[PDB]
């Protein structure tokens, strides 16, 4: 797990509408294991389901994604979970929607 990665710059502001932890995958509609893209905020399933998030990374190049299950951040390029001040806002707003 990285304390910083050179891709944190790609992280965009949380949309005005906010984040929805219960949002289904934009491609297959599944509600098991989804991630949110921290650059465009689109929601897609993880590698263990149908890998629509990694497919989104392939098409967009967007490096950082946040898990809606455990609120962790993965960087596709660095191939590691990243923990940094930049991810505090995204993780807060998401935790509030997941718990209160």
């Amino acid at each position: 797990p990285l304390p910083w990665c050179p891709h944190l710059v790609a992280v965009c502001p949380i949309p005005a509408a906010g984040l929805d932890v219960t949002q289904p995958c934009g491609d297959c509609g599944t509600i098991q294991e989804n991630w949110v893209c921290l650059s465009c905020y689109q929601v897609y399933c993880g590698r263990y389901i149908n890998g629509h998030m990694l497919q989104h990374h392939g098409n967009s190049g967007h490096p950082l994604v946040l898990s809606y299950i455990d609120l962790s951040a993965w960087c596709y390029y660095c191939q590691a979970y990243v923990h940094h001040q930049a991810l505090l806002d995204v993780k807060n707003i998401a935790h509030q929607n997941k718990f209160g």
Partner: peptide, 5 residues
């Protein structure tokens, strides 16, 4: 899950 995304 050990491998994210």
């Amino acid at each position: 899950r050990l491998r994210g995304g």
